[PDB]
Design a protein around this nucleic acid. Structure first.
Ligand code: DLU
Ligand code: DLU
Ligand code: MG
Ligand code: MG
Ligand code: MG
Ligand code: MG
Ligand code: NH4
Ligand code: NH4
Ligand code: ZN
Ligand code: ZN
Lengths: 368, 181, 368, 181
DNA sequence: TGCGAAATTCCATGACA
DNA sequence: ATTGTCATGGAATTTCGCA
DNA sequence: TGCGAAATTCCATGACA
DNA sequence: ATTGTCATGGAATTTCGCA
């Protein structure tokens, strides 16, 4: 208003307007001679509109917005008004990228026993082989021991069929997976209750959460690729070979094959390890229990220099999963209800549903 | 002489014909000698082909040094001999027409099967998984351990702590004598 | 052969076999009592076959391969024989991933004048807007000043039509682009010769090489997205607005808008900069020439701890561009003929054609 | 009073009807006052619509403070007035029926056009790009610089160092007197 | 009690939709 | 109302063979 | 000749098929 | 027979206003 700017012209002091500068009327506008030139001081009541006009030219951030305004104007604490509008521009908020990295990954404890936790997932679709297009991959958490099932679809039914065959051997406490339609259906839920099996799901669109199986997927494809070099991609008959071959391969860091971690002795496969020939089975299972508990466990890495960790009550935004062309990559702001661990949170989404979500699919909303 | 181990010796046999179930008639029985751990495979016939097909599944998990069987045609065929030689598996036959951990296990299987196929001689295909879990989490009086425990070195999440009757009840003996009619 | 292993049994010394160890015959095989147990020393003539068998179980690398062999065998310098086979396994060579990073990026000099170099590329396809699906983007190298043309296809013809309109203003020395069919056709080549324009092409599948335009693509899509929030994706009528808006936005690092770098004075657009009001045009163009030459230039970053730089005569492999499912991601080994710069090389491909190729699409072949 | 600048004032006019070329008949002429830099736009009619459509292209590169024109209908329509007001452009008209840098430039354009449309009165659409390059890389005797040089502060990569005849030859005067027949 | 060379361990890199 | 993983192959570091 | 606060500059982060 | 780039918004660093 003209209130503030009146005292200024008649040479009195107002907080924020430095006193060593000549303020004058001209063309109907309060002005000021600043080092860079003469700028108009607009009335406080005009400022928001100005910041907005400048911002809206190209929906620019702090500096690019200020540089436009500073061309014609000066007032005290300009960036504060800029940041105020940046924080209220829905369009910028949901479209701009983040420039803060996620905090460092958790390395959760290896499951203590075989059959404590299975990780499962589908690979595919693959070139048709005998009418089959997908592979069900099942990785035992503790041992890494893997089972492979060719399927025609990534369906609950084909999942149930394969697991009936597997669970003939042993029943797991937990089965962990992503939110594929196969694993989240109610038919599959009932199948697990029926057997005292607990279904665990990764936070959505975060395959790191079940990285064990994703990672075994790589080796499965890599060995299949080598075996299929210079031949047609008839992979179905090779699944058995790949399973056996991978289950009996050393992890250089662990010094054991997954077969060894599961059974504590090699079966009749080439280069079987003979070190326990003179022990009894019971002395063997005793050495196995010790071996199992002293396996190398990786430590959580250092944070990157510009990471963010969630705090309860923070405004954060979830990544749009499958964004259409020319549409924002971020949902509208939502509040952190609970910090489950430093990499996982429950948010209230503005509908508002409770969602449990990986920090990797989140950005902290900018400008508070 | 070195102590006995899992994978040292697999004992195979066929059971059947059974009543048709999802189009299957037989059961290939595999018992590991050291652990008494059992694996079952439904087949349509007691043939070399059905045997090879079933053992391929098993031998992509674990390969035995020796397979032991009677002198069934399936097992004495030269096809099956080739199959075994390819995998470095030694074949071993008991003399024609002629007690132990294995022998008792095969008894349990026949008996346990017979018990559960009463009133449902057709639904055995779907019960094979549970038959195996039962068998493999069954306490052995000689050793203090189940086959699960000896194969994996851990307790299981399905202990069958009910040592089950395994005997035919009065209603079921009358059901079996009426099934054959 | 039995030659070497004979002297050994009768207690004499052979280079590589340590003398403090008891070597003996048993079961028809030379053996040795090593700390970890008793291993068979196979005859030198058997070793290659053994290394190969072990490797082929799961086509494993150095350690996982050695761990298998060491189960049954010992001989001198085992890993040397392992590495020898790893280097000869075509399958592993063309399928395995690299674990050496590319050397640090070049930051080549900004073109000295406007119109010295244009970078061009297509965005699209986009949601249909008035029958249009693509955008031709043209970025002036020196200024960043950008021109946008809606097209129906990413064709040579639509390219020629748009550029005829642009080159009405000025003709560039150079036009730089990727190897899209539009830019590599002979019709387009003739169109450039006809005008004394030199066509420059980025090494294949390396959009960093013309990062200026790729990067302007991001801003073009980002502003289009914001403008289209909550409306249908009618982008055609917005192209003009986006062009003008972007050409008149400050780069915070440069302190100038691209319009300013091109013309040295703002046109009649909001928040026009007035600093040169009292200068003559000629004093303005003098300040512009000085401003143009003192623009911030980024320095080449530090190398990552495990990078590789090409050397003439090195075996290297080119990344397969669009690899089919279950097929190797790498071509067969090829030789570096010339190191153009530390990030670019000419290779002889085994056909053998000369190819000029980004180091980012190369891996150094492992095991020499 | 502040020195003259590019974008200070754009001078617009129509030239035509011309012979049809790709279905176009007129040329909207835009000359920046300070630099003499010329822009040309082919149109189908001398209408407010064709003007707005053409100037939208130009005004997405650079916006003039003032547009100067004669009192053509296209330019004095209230549609065109609205268009200009939306962009903060001031409109300016010369009085009806009534020398300078601009005036000479328009002469060159008419003359240069006439020269090149002989033997090819239909191919002018494709020549507009080169007409402009020629005009804009033409040396000005008053200032020591071409319009390119004054707009961009650099030499161009197409200097038309041949100050061209611009006159009609003997074969072309006879061609123009036979074109009207 | 220390040398040269081999063996083992470290660990950045990339890849699992 | 949950969580990255690990084969890979040069380089760094340790151990071995011998004195 | 040094304080508190504002302004400016730094620069990791991600994204352009 | 060629080559990454730059808006972004907290944090680090500098400059300003005043004494
Ligand atoms: C339709 C279901 C439901 C939900 O998600 C989709 C998409 N998806 C995506 C990936 C994926 O992006 N893998 C690459 C990867 C990336 C990062 C990392 F650390 C590890 C990785 F393996 C999968 O693996 C996967 O299984 C799925 C899938 O099943 N679905
Ligand atoms: C059919 C033509 C011929 C050859 O290549 C294809 C595929 N392609 C791919 C990208 C791309 O991957 N952009 C993402 C990106 C990645 C890294 C980076 F540093 C900068 C970046 F912009 C393009 O931009 C692009 O224009 C093309 C294209 O035109 N083609
Ligand atoms: Mg999945
Ligand atoms: Mg997956
Ligand atoms: Mg392209
Ligand atoms: Mg591109
Ligand atoms: N954990
Ligand atoms: N350069
Ligand atoms: Zn905005
Ligand atoms: Zn290999």
């Amino acid at each position: 208003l003209d209130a503030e700017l009146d005292q200024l012209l008649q040479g009195h002091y107002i907080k924020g307007y430095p006193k060593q500068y000549t303020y004058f009327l001209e063309d109907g506008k309060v002005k000021v001679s600043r080092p860079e030139g003469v700028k108009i001081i607009p009335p406080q009541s005009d400022r928001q509109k100005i910041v907005l006009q400048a911002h809206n030219l190209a929906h620019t951030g702090r500096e690019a917005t200020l540089l436009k305004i500073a061309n014609l104007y000066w007032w005290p604490n300009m960036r504060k008004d800029v940041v105020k509008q940046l924080g209220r521009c829905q369009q910028c908020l949901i479209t701009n990228a983040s420039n803060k990295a996620s905090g460092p990954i958790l390395r959760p404890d290896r499951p203590q026993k075989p059959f404590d936790k299975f990780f499962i997932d589908y690979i595919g679709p693959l070139p048709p082989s005998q009418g089959y297009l997908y592979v069900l991959v099942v990785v035992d958490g503790m041992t890494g021991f893997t089972w492979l099932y060719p399927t025609k679809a990534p369906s609950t039914s084909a999942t149930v069929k394969s697991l009936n065959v597997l669970t003939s051997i042993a029943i797991p406490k937990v089965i962990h997976s992503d939110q594929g339609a196969a694993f989240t259906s109610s038919t599959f839920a009932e199948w697990a209750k029926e057997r005292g099996i607990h279904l665990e799901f990764s936070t959505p669109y975060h395959p790191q959460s079940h990285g064990k199986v994703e990672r075994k997927n790589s080796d499965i494809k890599r060995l299949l690729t080598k075996l299929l070099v210079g031949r047609p991609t008839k992979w179905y008959d090779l699944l058995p070979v790949v399973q056996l071959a991978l289950n009996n391969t050393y992890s250089p860091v662990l010094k054991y094959t997954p077969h060894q971690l599961l059974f504590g002795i090699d079966s009749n496969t080439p280069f079987a390890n003979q070190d326990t020939l003179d022990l009894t089975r019971e002395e063997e299972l005793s050495l196995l229990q010790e071996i199992r508990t002293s396996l190398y466990h990786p430590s959580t890495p250092p944070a990157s220099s510009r990471s963010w960790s969630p705090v309860v009550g923070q405004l954060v935004q979830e990544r749009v999963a499958r964004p259409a062309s020319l549409r924002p990559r971020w949902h509208k702001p939502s509040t952190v209800l609970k910090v489950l661990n430093p990499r996982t949170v429950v948010i209230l989404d503005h509908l508002g549903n409770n969602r449990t979500v990986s920090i990797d699919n989140l950005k902290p909303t900018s400008h508070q | 002489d070195r102590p006995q181990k899992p994978f040292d010796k697999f004992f195979i046999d066929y059971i059947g014909p059974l009543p048709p179930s999802q189009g299957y008639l037989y059961v290939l029985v595999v018992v590991d000698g050291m652990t008494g751990f059992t694996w079952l495979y439904p087949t349509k016939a007691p043939s070399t082909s059905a045997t090879v097909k079933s053992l391929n599944v098993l031998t992509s998990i674990a390969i035995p040094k020796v397979i032991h069987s009677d002198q069934g045609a399936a097992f004495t065929s030269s096809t099956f001999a080739e199959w075994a030689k390819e995998r470095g598996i030694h074949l071993e036959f008991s003399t024609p027409y002629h007690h132990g951990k294995v022998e008792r296990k095969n008894s349990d299987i026949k008996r346990l099967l017979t018990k559960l196929l009463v009133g449902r001689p057709t639904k055995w295909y779907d019960l094979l998984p549970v038959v195996q879990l039962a068998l493999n989490n069954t306490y052995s009086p000689v050793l203090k351990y189940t086959p699960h425990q000896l194969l994996f070195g851990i307790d299981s999440n399905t202990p069958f702590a009910n040592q089950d009757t395994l005997d035919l009840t009065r209603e079921e003996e009358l059901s079996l004598l009426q099934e054959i009619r």
